[PDB]
Design an enzyme around this catalytic site. Structure first.
Site, PDB file in Angstrom:
ATOM      1  N   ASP A 173      11.224   7.432  -6.816  1.00 27.98           N
ATOM      2  CA  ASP A 173      10.449   6.428  -7.539  1.00 27.98           C
ATOM      3  C   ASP A 173       9.118   6.129  -6.853  1.00 27.98           C
ATOM      4  O   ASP A 173       9.066   5.367  -5.888  1.00 27.98           O
ATOM      5  CB  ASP A 173      11.268   5.146  -7.661  1.00 27.98           C
ATOM      6  CG  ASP A 173      10.634   4.128  -8.580  1.00 27.98           C
ATOM      7  OD1 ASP A 173       9.490   4.343  -9.024  1.00 27.98           O
ATOM      8  OD2 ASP A 173      11.305   3.114  -8.875  1.00 27.98           O
ATOM      9  N   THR A 174       8.062   6.803  -7.298  1.00 25.89           N
ATOM     10  CA  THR A 174       6.735   6.646  -6.700  1.00 25.89           C
ATOM     11  C   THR A 174       6.147   5.251  -6.952  1.00 25.89           C
ATOM     12  O   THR A 174       5.244   4.816  -6.232  1.00 25.89           O
ATOM     13  CB  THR A 174       5.745   7.702  -7.228  1.00 25.89           C
ATOM     14  OG1 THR A 174       5.681   7.627  -8.656  1.00 25.89           O
ATOM     15  CG2 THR A 174       6.166   9.110  -6.821  1.00 25.89           C
ATOM     16  N   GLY A 175       6.709   4.533  -7.913  1.00 28.32           N
ATOM     17  CA  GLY A 175       6.274   3.171  -8.207  1.00 28.32           C
ATOM     18  C   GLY A 175       6.905   2.121  -7.312  1.00 28.32           C
ATOM     19  O   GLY A 175       6.600   0.929  -7.421  1.00 28.32           O
TER      20      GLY A 175
HETATM   21  C1  LIG Z   1      15.247   3.219 -17.497  1.00 27.25           C
HETATM   22  O1  LIG Z   1      14.521   1.987 -17.518  1.00 27.25           O
HETATM   23  C2  LIG Z   1      13.358   2.076 -16.814  1.00 27.25           C
HETATM   24  O2  LIG Z   1      12.746   3.143 -16.718  1.00 27.25           O
HETATM   25  N1  LIG Z   1      12.847   0.975 -16.266  1.00 27.25           N
HETATM   26  C3  LIG Z   1      11.626   1.053 -15.452  1.00 27.25           C
HETATM   27  C4  LIG Z   1      11.895   0.531 -14.029  1.00 27.25           C
HETATM   28  O3  LIG Z   1      11.900  -0.680 -13.780  1.00 27.25           O
HETATM   29  N2  LIG Z   1      12.425   1.468 -13.213  1.00 27.25           N
HETATM   30  N3  LIG Z   1      12.859   1.132 -12.151  1.00 27.25           N
HETATM   31  C5  LIG Z   1      12.091   1.795 -11.094  1.00 27.25           C
HETATM   32  C6  LIG Z   1      11.300   0.789 -10.254  1.00 27.25           C
HETATM   33  C7  LIG Z   1      10.118   0.264 -11.076  1.00 27.25           C
HETATM   34  C8  LIG Z   1       9.017  -0.290 -10.162  1.00 27.25           C
HETATM   35  O4  LIG Z   1       8.453   0.809  -9.426  1.00 27.25           O
HETATM   36  C9  LIG Z   1       7.922  -0.905 -11.056  1.00 27.25           C
HETATM   37  C10 LIG Z   1       7.045  -1.696 -10.310  1.00 27.25           C
HETATM   38  C11 LIG Z   1       7.078  -3.083 -10.423  1.00 27.25           C
HETATM   39  C12 LIG Z   1       6.243  -3.871  -9.638  1.00 27.25           C
HETATM   40  C13 LIG Z   1       5.307  -3.278  -8.796  1.00 27.25           C
HETATM   41  C14 LIG Z   1       5.279  -1.891  -8.691  1.00 27.25           C
HETATM   42  C15 LIG Z   1       6.100  -1.101  -9.488  1.00 27.25           C
HETATM   43  C16 LIG Z   1       4.474  -4.046  -7.972  1.00 27.25           C
HETATM   44  C17 LIG Z   1       5.086  -5.243  -7.588  1.00 27.25           C
HETATM   45  C18 LIG Z   1       5.845  -5.345  -6.419  1.00 27.25           C
HETATM   46  C19 LIG Z   1       6.398  -4.225  -5.788  1.00 27.25           C
HETATM   47  N4  LIG Z   1       7.720  -3.925  -6.386  1.00 27.25           N
HETATM   48  C20 LIG Z   1       8.303  -2.666  -6.215  1.00 27.25           C
HETATM   49  O5  LIG Z   1       7.667  -1.837  -5.552  1.00 27.25           O
HETATM   50  C21 LIG Z   1       9.438  -2.338  -6.997  1.00 27.25           C
HETATM   51  C22 LIG Z   1      10.685  -2.079  -6.119  1.00 27.25           C
HETATM   52  C23 LIG Z   1      11.756  -1.324  -6.915  1.00 27.25           C
HETATM   53  C24 LIG Z   1      10.327  -1.284  -4.860  1.00 27.25           C
HETATM   54  N5  LIG Z   1       9.148  -1.205  -7.921  1.00 27.25           N
HETATM   55  C25 LIG Z   1       9.527  -1.254  -9.267  1.00 27.25           C
HETATM   56  O6  LIG Z   1      10.227  -2.198  -9.654  1.00 27.25           O
HETATM   57  C26 LIG Z   1      14.262   1.541 -12.005  1.00 27.25           C
HETATM   58  C27 LIG Z   1      15.075   0.998 -13.000  1.00 27.25           C
HETATM   59  C28 LIG Z   1      15.713   1.845 -13.896  1.00 27.25           C
HETATM   60  C29 LIG Z   1      16.629   1.339 -14.812  1.00 27.25           C
HETATM   61  C30 LIG Z   1      16.861  -0.030 -14.881  1.00 27.25           C
HETATM   62  C31 LIG Z   1      18.089  -1.883 -15.830  1.00 27.25           C
HETATM   63  C32 LIG Z   1      17.768  -0.530 -15.814  1.00 27.25           C
HETATM   64  C33 LIG Z   1      18.351   0.329 -16.742  1.00 27.25           C
HETATM   65  C34 LIG Z   1      19.287  -0.149 -17.653  1.00 27.25           C
HETATM   66  N6  LIG Z   1      19.661  -1.496 -17.624  1.00 27.25           N
HETATM   67  C35 LIG Z   1      19.062  -2.361 -16.701  1.00 27.25           C
HETATM   68  C36 LIG Z   1      16.260  -0.870 -13.951  1.00 27.25           C
HETATM   69  C37 LIG Z   1      15.393  -0.353 -12.992  1.00 27.25           C
HETATM   70  C38 LIG Z   1      10.493   0.314 -16.163  1.00 27.25           C
HETATM   71  C39 LIG Z   1       9.303   0.155 -15.229  1.00 27.25           C
HETATM   72  C40 LIG Z   1      10.076   1.109 -17.395  1.00 27.25           C
HETATM   73  C41 LIG Z   1      10.967  -1.078 -16.598  1.00 27.25           C
END
Ligand SMILES: COC(=O)N[C@H](C(=O)NN(CCC[C@@]1(O)Cc2ccc(cc2)C/C=C\CNC(=O)[C@H](C(C)C)NC1=O)Cc1ccc(-c2cccnc2)cc1)C(C)(C)C
Ligand SMILES: [Cl-]
Ligand SMILES: [Cl-]
Ligand SMILES: [Cl-]
Lengths: 99, 99
Positions: free
Chosen positions: A25-27
């Site tokens: 997860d590059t994000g």
């Molecule tokens: C499949 O659904 C998704 O793709 N969800 C995605 C998602 O949240 N995916 N997450 C990956 C992490 C996303 C993100 O990089 C997204 C993100 C959010 C905030 C920021 C950067 C990037 C900046 C703010 C503060 C720093 N926060 C973070 O760096 C966090 C932490 C995890 C380290 N980073 C993130 O949360 C992982 C994730 C995957 C599934 C799911 C919940 C998920 C699936 C099903 N049911 C409940 C929840 C989280 C979306 C962005 C489209 C909502």
């Protein structure tokens, strides 16, 4: 390897004597895993994403293996909906985005 | 380009004639941007992140430039902590992970 993004980039990790699947997860700043035991000291942390924040335990200097690539770093543990490998460990295995 | 992950992988995008900053996020299925105006009709979607779920507006077939690379696809708009470019558009611009 070269990993396509047609599908979610899931890999096997080895940590604390356990095998787990996690998302590259590059994000993500940080690596966050579902509840599990790890040795040594920890301190509480709040981390935020879409939907708001969760409380996690922060463990430092944890050995991990990701696709046969060994690294060491901070691992957060708590009620994340899915296991994510963040930039703090992606750097250590030499992972880059390319286009 | 090749983008390392020692810092957040923030890039400039262009959408609706305007430049914005967005995060290249291989952990995201979808692309979600902070509140903005887009043309046409939208459909409901609920997306899930680390902190839980949010409602967003889904717009389809939207032109968007990412680091100068042209894409046209689905853009979600809602209360995200940051603009994120997810796999739906990362695949359009030929992005892979490599290590
Ligand atoms: C499949 O659904 C998704 O793709 N969800 C995605 C998602 O949240 N995916 N997450 C990956 C992490 C996303 C993100 O990089 C997204 C993100 C959010 C905030 C920021 C950067 C990037 C900046 C703010 C503060 C720093 N926060 C973070 O760096 C966090 C932490 C995890 C380290 N980073 C993130 O949360 C992982 C994730 C995957 C599934 C799911 C919940 C998920 C699936 C099903 N049911 C409940 C929840 C989280 C979306 C962005 C489209 C909502
Ligand atoms: Cl670290
Ligand atoms: Cl490097
Ligand atoms: Cl799309």
């Amino acid at each position: 390897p070269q990993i396509t993004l047609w599908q979610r980039p899931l890999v096997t990790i080895k940590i604390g004597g356990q095998l787990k699947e996690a998302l590259l997860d590059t994000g993500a700043d940080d690596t966050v895993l579902e509840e599990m035991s790890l040795p040594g000291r920890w301190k509480p942390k709040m981390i935020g994403g879409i939907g708001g924040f969760i409380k996690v335990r922060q463990y430092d200097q944890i050995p991990i293996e990701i696709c046969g690539h060994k690294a060491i770093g901070t691992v957060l543990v708590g009620p994340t909906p899915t296991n994510v490998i963040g930039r703090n460990l992606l750097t250590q295995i030499g992972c880059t985005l390319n286009f």
